[PDB]
Amino acid sequence: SDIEVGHSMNLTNHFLVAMPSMKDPYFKRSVIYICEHNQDGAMGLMINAPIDITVGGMLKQVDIEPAYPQSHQENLKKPVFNGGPVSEDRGFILHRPRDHYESSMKMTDDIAVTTSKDILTVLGTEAEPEGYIVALGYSGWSAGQLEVELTENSWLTIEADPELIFNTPVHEKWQKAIQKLGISP
């Protein structure tokens, strides 16, 4: 009774699945990997909103001189993603843990977020992650707006896993998500 624990929930390393009754059209049928979730708001990365720029595209744009020969070339043609409306000029790399990068936050043995530029010099090369998403800008929620929108029937949530982020056709991520929640597309 004096011993509190709070039912809590903590949505980090969790996917937010847009629900049919979703408002912000921006998020209509979005799947969001939640990175941070403290008492000062939330930070997530959309994982299925691809944009008009390719990985090699922004690599050339940001003008990053590659460390090793870029032998891959196929994945270098893949799309870059819009991670959210906030800080669209910033890049976030959601990937499978491989080598050590300066600014990086490991989430699981299979998912991590790197924000240092050092990682860009291995993209297209054989030193790149075995699965990564290049996202510009991120999704943000103030103090407890997350909780609210949740109880507002706006989203559904499932624990995140790597296969949905790196091994699932972009335009298929959503459908396969709500699937795990029972609801059918």
Curated annotation (Swiss-Prot):
The family annotation for this protein states: Belongs to the UPF0301 (AlgH) family.
Query: Highest taxon of the source?
Result: Bacteria
Q: Which Gene3D superfamilies match?
A: VC0467-like, VC0467-like domains
**Spans traversing the lipid bilayer:** none
Which InterPro entries does the protein's record reference? AlgH-like
> Do you know which HAMAP family this protein is assigned to?
UPF0301
PANTHER family referenced in this protein's UniProt entry, alphabetically: UNCHARACTERIZED PROTEIN YQGE, UPF0301 PROTEIN YQGE
What name has this protein been given in UniProt? UPF0301 protein VC_0467
Q: What GO CC terms are in its UniProt record?
A: cytosol
Q: Which Pfam families match?
A: DUF179
